[PDB]
Ligand binder design. Sequence first.
Ligand code: HEM
Ligand code: MG
Length: 301
Amino acid sequence: GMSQVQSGILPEHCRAAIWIEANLKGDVNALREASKIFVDNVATFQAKFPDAKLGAVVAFGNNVWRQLSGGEGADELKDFPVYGKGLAPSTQYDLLIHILSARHEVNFSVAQAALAAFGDAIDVKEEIHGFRWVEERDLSGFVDGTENPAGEETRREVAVIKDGVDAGGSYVFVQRWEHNLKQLNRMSVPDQEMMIGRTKDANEEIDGDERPVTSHLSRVDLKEDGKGLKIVRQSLPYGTASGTHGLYFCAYCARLYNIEQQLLSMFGDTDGKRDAMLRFTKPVTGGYYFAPSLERIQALG
Ligand code: HEM
Ligand SMILES: [Mg+2]
């Protein structure tokens, strides 16, 4: 008489992921059977590829989740708003599929299964293939993940709703960034470090009173009476070397509040200052989704 978290929220150090963002084309009913088939497929792939350490998440946007849940729970869920009067654009869709594992080839089979399950009920808007880069660095050359919640216990505390109707569920935020590495390269390494808030090569934190308030760490390392507003990031680099490339940002949190506070900070809504990373990269998509517990996907009918 308890809830099980979907398999894709908690895994750490996965080398590869696939994110699919889509709109509902017909009657929302279509999503009930599809979602059950999809989590069943995931169980099948986990049985066939035990060494892939595969996980997946199916999450819903505000409008369709409100219909599927009958308005019960997910109290913080809302369409992704524009932040910074447009600095952060909004591309709220109806369905998010997040697949992550040690094997891209398995992720790809799982993605085809997802598409077969939902079929023509969805309009695919974005399909991004994430890959861990050398030393777990973002394409900018800075390590991404150092202060991310570590271990199943702490990641559950941060990401998974603890009781009531939503127990086992989580709020998800996705935002695709397009890096301009030419612009980044014009910056001296010390200027880059002051932009991030950590040294580039050795990845040492720069003290808060040494770095500008516009540094990334000064914008997102937030505390409320000493209590950090933590989130579980699953972001990964993506793209081609000669084409579009950047970071596919993805975060999970028991409370949408922690994510929103960091976005208001980054995009200038809190103190009128904005994140220094906007000097070389920009966000081009944005959405908020609710990841129900596995058993709630099983009580969809
Ligand atoms: C281009 C997009 C982004 C890049 C390249 C980026 C890069 C980084 C880097 C290099 C770090 C330091 C290492 C680490 O602790 O993980 C970091 C930390 C962090 N980022 Fe970002 N980030 C991006 C977007 C975002 C967004 C949109 C959010 C939240 C809405 C976010 C939240 C965080 C948090 C919470 C930390 C940990 C800070 C701490 O407690 O020290 N990041 N990011
Ligand atoms: Mg800190």
